[PDB]
Design a protein around this nucleic acid. Structure first.
Lengths: 502, 113, 82
DNA sequence: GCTAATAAACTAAAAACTATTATTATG
DNA sequence: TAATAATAGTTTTTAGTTTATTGGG
């Protein structure tokens, strides 16, 4: 476990963000409003266990524990909730902004030293393990402190102090018709050449709703692989791919909505009196005879070896059947917590097996009273992309070897060939349908629709967002690109009267 | 008195839903603990009825799984334990009441937490 | 056993298929039945569950009165299966 | 023309993961 | 007289159920 992420949003309460040169486009205030809605929805989906806050500056009024004028905290650092979303949406729109200007001031002066003070205080209020302190400002003018030289000086001094205290300030470009004018007052003041008449730096991804749990880094188990019996090496086991499942529901009352707990009891029938686990006897009836046993023998019959890995040998990667797959593989990394120096030997063995193209087959015991399976550890060399970031971790791929009784028998199938011209037809059809696949191209539409419905009902929308399913083939485009080829190959193989459907 | 005014403030101090309320409550409870831990002959008897009201006070008021109540309740329990450790049987009139509270304390949301 | 279905390509090509689970994880087909410690009977030892309120002296919520909800960020919304 | 499993979703349940906190040690 | 050391508190699978649902005859 490590620290968490803290996010601060600070919008200027002025006239610039409530107006635009083209009213057909979104006002900076309102577009920032949809921006924060989108980021809060994404945070709810992904990392709702962190802290988010809303605060404005330049407003005519003020409200903050620091009691700085024109400084008004709208939301304290807190986990996002639908109440926050609606509290923000009521100010959304070209009428919500008018409301905001009605019962909330805007346009007065401010001090960046003051806002830095209040945000530092708010961050200091958090007593939890933090790792990221990101502050996002929302204004399109570098001048307002350039107007007062002393104000700019103290603002940049406090900004430097804050950035030295681990606070990370990032700049949100806002649509200034005269230009955002970076490098004039900002890059020397922000923690990090077009003057940015526009606003879109990465606001496209900020507005982009993301549906992902994104579980933080964790160790499934730090098993300790024994070579023969005593030369034993600590290793870490992870699952870089792991099935994402719907969170379980919450039993609650249909008249108060509060979650009602459930208690479960094993008891008698003739008397109905509550009974004990000692009163429970495991039974299994085979044929006509019932065998009586207890649980402890049941797990002891599953207990053969200690939790760990027992090497079976070495085998070239060619000696494994491609269709021989049982369960999704795991990733194995060297670990130096229990056994120190194992990283050197891990590097040596990785180099040697990569040179010898032989994977390591081992007897695997996950935990106590667990079956030891057969696992093949393929070398997995580190790969870096263009920006030299790790796209393939260095280590080992731990795949599972199904047993003889883990494979099922099929009715025998004969071999029937095809003419090479039909093969050419297939190749042409494939080329007309070819593309490049990437692992980040297809999602689970069922889960996405479930989400969209969940947020829609949480937001009490009259209608939910429809999930875009990429697993639906575009039949019209495929038919357009194929045309003759389909029925040409049909006539090549299928008799004209004998359609594939009887 | 100091015990009485602190009891009244804590009976108020939980009016708002915030962890700060629990912080101030447990601070006042710690001061009450260090105060009434050493009475002479008399302040203990006042603390008896004060504990009555404040005991049943939180029993019916806090009544929430919020941790801000949880630390205060556990400190209250620790103080009551160290009190009854050397307090005499004069607390017996409250005890069965406390009994009628204590299990009701535990079997309630305290069971959930 | 086969899987009688039809592969499809676009809206103008389809072929009937018969899929087979060549590799399949195995499980025990006989569960561990629970019986009495004295009569060794499951009949004498049957089961129930209780949905009682977390407060109010564990007042019993009626079996169907419970409705599932779901965690939503910092909030929980009631949400039935229907 | 007479009924027939089945994986999904549902539980319990069991372990690993940080995260602390009496406890002598000494006086 | 005051320091250390197992130690319980949130996630995450995963074995055993439980649902009706297609597939037939």
């Amino acid at each position: 476990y490590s620290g968490r992420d803290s996010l601060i949003f600070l919008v200027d309460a002025s006239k610039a963000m409530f107006e635009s040169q083209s009213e057909d486009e979104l006002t900076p205030f309102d577009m920032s409003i949809q921006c924060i809605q989108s980021v809060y929805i994404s945070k709810i989906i992904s990392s709702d266990r962190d802290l988010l806050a809303v605060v404005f500056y330049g407003t005519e009024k003020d409200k903050n524990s620091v009691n700085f004028k024109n400084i008004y905290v709208l939301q304290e650092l807190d986990n996002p909730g639908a109440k926050r979303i609606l509290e923000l949406d009521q100010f959304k729109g070209q009428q919500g902004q008018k409301r905001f200007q009605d019962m909330m001031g805007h346009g007065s002066d401010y001090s960046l030293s003051e806002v830095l003070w209040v945000c530092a205080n708010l961050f200091s209020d958090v007593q939890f393990k933090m790792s990221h302190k990101r502050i996002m400002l929302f204004t399109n003018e570098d001048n307002p402190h350039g107007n007062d030289s002393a104000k700019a000086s103290r603002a940049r001094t406090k900004a430097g102090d804050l950035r030295d205290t681990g606070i990370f300030l990032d700049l949100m470009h806002l649509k200034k018709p005269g230009g955002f004018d970076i490098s004039l007052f900002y890059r020397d003041i922000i923690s990090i050449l077009r003057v940015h008449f526009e606003e879109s730096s990465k606001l496209e991804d900020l507005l982009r709703k993301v549906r992902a749990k994104e579980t933080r880094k964790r160790a499934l188990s730090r098993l300790k692989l024994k070579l023969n019996k005593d030369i034993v090496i600590s290793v870490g086991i992870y699952n870089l791919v792991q099935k994402a499942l719907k969170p379980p529901p919450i039993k609650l009352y249909r008249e108060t909505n509060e979650p009602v707990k459930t208690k479960t009891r094993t008891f008698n029938t003739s008397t109905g009196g509550l009974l004990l686990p000692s009163d429970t006897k495991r039974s299994q009836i085979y044929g006509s005879r019932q065998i009586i046993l207890e649980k402890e023998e049941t797990e002891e019959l599953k207990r053969f070896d200690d939790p760990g890995l027992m090497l079976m040998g070495f085998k070239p990667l060619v000696l494994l059947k491609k269709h021989h797959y049982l369960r999704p593989s795991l990733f194995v990394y060297p670990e130096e917590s229990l056994v120190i120096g194992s990283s050197t030997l891990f590097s040596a063995l990785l180099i040697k097996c990569l040179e010898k193209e032989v994977a390591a087959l081992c007897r695997y015991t996950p935990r106590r009273n667990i079956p030891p399976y057969f696992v093949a550890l393929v070398p997995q060399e580190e790969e870096l992309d263009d920006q030299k970031i790790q796209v393939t971790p260095p280590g080992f791929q731990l795949v599972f070897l199904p047993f003889a009784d883990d494979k099922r028998k099929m009715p025998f199938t004969e071999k029937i060939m095809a003419t090479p011209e039909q093969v050419g037809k297939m190749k042409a059809i494939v080329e007309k349908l070819r593309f490049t696949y990437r692992s980040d191209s297809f999602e689970n539409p069922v889960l996405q629709q479930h989400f969209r419905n969940l947020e829609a009902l949480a937001l009490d929308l009259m209608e939910p967002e429809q999930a875009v399913d990429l697993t639906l083939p575009k039949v019209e485009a495929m038919n357009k690109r194929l045309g003759s080829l389909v029925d040409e190959f049909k006539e090549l193989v299928y008799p004209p009267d004998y359609n594939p459907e009887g | 008195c100091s015990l009485l005014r602190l009891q009244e403030t804590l009976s108020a101090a939980d009016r708002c839903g915030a962890a700060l309320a629990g912080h101030q409550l447990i601070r006042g409870l710690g001061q009450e603990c260090v105060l009434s831990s050493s009475p002479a002959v008399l302040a203990l008897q006042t603390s008896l009825v004060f504990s009555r009201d404040f005991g049943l006070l939180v029993f019916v008021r806090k009544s929430l799984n919020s941790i801000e109540f949880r630390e205060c309740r556990e400190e209250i329990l620790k103080f009551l334990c160290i009190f009854l450790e050397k307090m005499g049987q004069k607390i017996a009139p409250y005890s069965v009441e406390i009994k009628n509270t204590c299990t009701s304390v535990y079997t309630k949301d305290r069971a959930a937490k | 056993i086969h899987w009688p279905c039809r592969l499809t390509i676009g809206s103008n090509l389809s072929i009937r298929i018969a899929a087979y689970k060549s590799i399949l994880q195995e499980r025990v087909k006989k569960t561990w039945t629970v019986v009495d410690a004295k009569t060794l009977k499951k009949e004498d030892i049957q089961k129930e569950t209780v949905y009682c309120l977390n407060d109010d002296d564990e007042t019993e919520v009626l079996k169907e009165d419970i409705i599932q909800g779901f965690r939503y960020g910092s909030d929980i919304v009631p949400f039935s299966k229907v």
